[PDB]
Amino acid sequence: INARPLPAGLTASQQWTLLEWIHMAGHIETEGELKAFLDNILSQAPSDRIILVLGRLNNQNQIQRMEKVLNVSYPSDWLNQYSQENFAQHDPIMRIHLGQGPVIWEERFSRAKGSEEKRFIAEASSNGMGSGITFSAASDRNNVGSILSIGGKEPGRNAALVAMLNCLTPHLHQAAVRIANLPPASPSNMPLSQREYDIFHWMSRGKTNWEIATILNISERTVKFHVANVIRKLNANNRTHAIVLGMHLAMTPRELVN
Amino acid sequence: INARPLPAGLTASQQWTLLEWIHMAGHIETEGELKAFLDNILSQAPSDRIILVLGRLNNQNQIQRMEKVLNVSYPSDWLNQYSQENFAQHDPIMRIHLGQGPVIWEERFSRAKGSEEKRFIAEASSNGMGSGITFSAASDRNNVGSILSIGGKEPGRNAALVAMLNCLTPHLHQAAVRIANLPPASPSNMPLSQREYDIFHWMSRGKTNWEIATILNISERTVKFHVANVIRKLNANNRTHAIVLGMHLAMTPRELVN
Numbered sequence: 113i114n115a116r117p118l119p120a121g122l123t124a125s126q127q128w129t130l131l132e133w134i135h136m137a138g139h140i141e142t143e144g145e146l147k148a149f150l151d152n153i154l155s156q157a158p159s160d161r162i163i164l165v166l167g168r169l170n171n172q173n174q175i176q177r178m179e180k181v182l183n184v185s186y187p188s189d190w191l192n193q194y195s196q197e198n199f200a201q202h203d204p205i206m207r208i209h210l211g212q213g214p215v216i217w218e219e220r221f222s223r224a225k226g227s228e229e230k231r232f233i234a235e236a237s238s239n240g241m242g243s244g245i246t247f248s249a250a251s252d253r254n255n256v257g258s259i260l261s262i263g264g265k266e267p268g269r270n271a272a273l274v275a276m277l278n279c280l281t282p283h284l285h286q287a288a289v290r291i292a293n294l295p296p297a298s299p300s301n302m303p304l305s306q307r308e309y310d311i312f313h314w315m316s317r318g319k320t321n322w323e324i325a326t327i328l329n330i331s332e333r334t335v336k337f338h339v340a341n342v343i344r345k346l347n348a349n350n351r352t353h354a355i356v357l358g359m360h361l362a363m364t365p366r367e368l369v370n
Numbered sequence: 371i372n373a374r375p376l377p378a379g380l381t382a383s384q385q386w387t388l389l390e391w392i393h394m395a396g397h398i399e400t401e402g403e404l405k406a407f408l409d410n411i412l413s414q415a416p417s418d419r420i421i422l423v424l425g426r427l428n429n430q431n432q433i434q435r436m437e438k439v440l441n442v443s444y445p446s447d448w449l450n451q452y453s454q455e456n457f458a459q460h461d462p463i464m465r466i467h468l469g470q471g472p473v474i475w476e477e478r479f480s481r482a483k484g485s486e487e488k489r490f491i492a493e494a495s496s497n498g499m500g501s502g503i504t505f506s507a508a509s510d511r512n513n514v515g516s517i518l519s520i521g522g523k524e525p526g527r528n529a530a531l532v533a534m535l536n537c538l539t540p541h542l543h544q545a546a547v548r549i550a551n552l553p554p555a556s557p558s559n560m561p562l563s564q565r566e567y568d569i570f571h572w573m574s575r576g577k578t579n580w581e582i583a584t585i586l587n588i589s590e591r592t593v594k595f596h597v598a599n600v601i602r603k604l605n606a607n608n609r610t611h612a613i614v615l616g617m618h619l620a621m622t623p624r625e626l627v628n
């Protein structure tokens with residue numbers, strides 16, 4: 113399993129708080145809960161400005177297109193300008209390879225050479241957005257990742273909080289994915305027709321295609337067709353794999369009565 | 371946020387292991403990782419038999435239909451019989467309200483009065499499946515939940531491990547949901563057409579429907595239609611809400627260049 117390592121320096125009190133944070137994050141299912149949770153654990157200073165952005169990524173894990181903007185406390189004026197002036201294309205923070213460690217904005221701003229990037233930096237600055245830090249995480253089996261940005265003074269000064277937030281970020285990302293209602297990581301199974309299910313029923317009992325043909329009184333030609341469709345609908349590699357992957361269907365062919 | 375409380379009794383060593391477990395669980399994206407992870411942290415005794423079942427739930431959080439069967443170490447003979455004899459409908463463990471605390475099977479077996487339940491108990495027993503424990507968790511905004519079953523001797527004797535596993539279960543459940551590739555918790559946004567996007571572009575800049583009509587040279591009648599479709603596709607409550615919910619579309623109308 114690919115996961116950033118837990119932070120080593122932490123006091124027992126910090127280790128507990130982080131466990132609470134990650135455990136709670138894993139229960140977040142609504143945008144409201146996520147907004148409230150981000151707001152809470154980043155409450156002081158009340159002058160900080162927070163946003164989480166979920167995006168579709170290229171093969172370098174950089175955001176290609178945003179999937180969801182979850183504002184916590186970015187100024188609406190700034191978001192308006194960011195949208196209208198297409199700052200996503202000029203914002204050095206948007207070029208980050210998601211899943212690396214925290215990025216203090218000046219690390220990037222101090223190195224920006226391009227005209228559009230310099231303009232963005234000046235505009236950000238005049239909007240009170242000149243300094244900050246960004247945490248990020250990316251999924252392994254779906255091209256999506258989130259950035260968590262905190263704008264404000266003295267970004268990253270609290271080293272332990274940075275480590276804890278960095279560790280928490282992947283969990284905030286997964287929560288963002290849940291609340292964003294995206295298509296599944298890989299295609300869902302497709303519902304079998306009754307005839308495909310009847311065929312799968314006998315597959316699951318160890319019947320050969322010919323035996324199934326006999327039982328259903330159709331040619332094996334037809335059985336083979338249905339079997340191919342069952343395998344496809346279950347995203348299986350073969351007949352035998354489909355029987356394993358489709359076990360849930362064979363176990364509860366109808367609504368369980370309670 | 372609705373979440374079972376962290377366990378209080380734990381030693382510092384146990385508190386750390388649990389953090390590692392929950393943090394790692396939150397990174398699981400494949401069935402293989404989940405199978406390997408369950409196997410690992412439940413390794414002794416190697417005589418234990420483990421399965422995770424993800425299901426669609428009724429309004430009492432009981433499984434109505436299975437969505438995925440993730441076998442770790444249940445005997446294949448037993449799964450075969452369970453499928454063929456429709457034991458899902460007779461298994462007292464399948465009647466559990468998912469999300470309660472751990473269930474030692476005998477708690478239920480000792481109270482089972484019905485003929486089919488008694489038969490199931492006898493069959494389970496003869497297959498080495500007579501004793502065990504089941505952990506469970508359920509989602510709040512999607513009718514899905516998982517049971518994690520461990521069959522074996524002296525179920526639940528290690529109180530600290532029970533507490534830690536119980537705490538971990540919701541996170542295993544969310545991982546199961548990811549790997550099962552289900553439809554989103556609520557419907558995904560629908561892709562806007564170019565014309566709907568052009569309309570949303572101006573919505574996002576504060577243009578009224580009439581102003582948009584003027585800019586696009588169409589009637590406001592037509593604009594209203596497109597606006598209704600934009601609101602619907604973004605699952606928004608109204609025009610103004612759609613502008614917030616659709617901010618990602620306005621911010622990255624095209625692929626970001628990197």
Ligand SMILES: CCCCCC(=O)N[C@H]1CCOC1=O
Binds near residue numbers: 163194205242259261
């Ligand atoms: C509006 C989404 C912004 C995501 C990336 C980010 O946080 N960028 C910082 C950099 C300075 O101003 C910002 O908005």
Ligand SMILES: CCCCCC(=O)N[C@H]1CCOC1=O
Binds near residue numbers: 421449452463500504
């Ligand atoms: C095959 C899925 C079983 C899920 C529920 C469960 O673990 N039931 C136990 C009870 C005795 O035998 C079993 O299989």
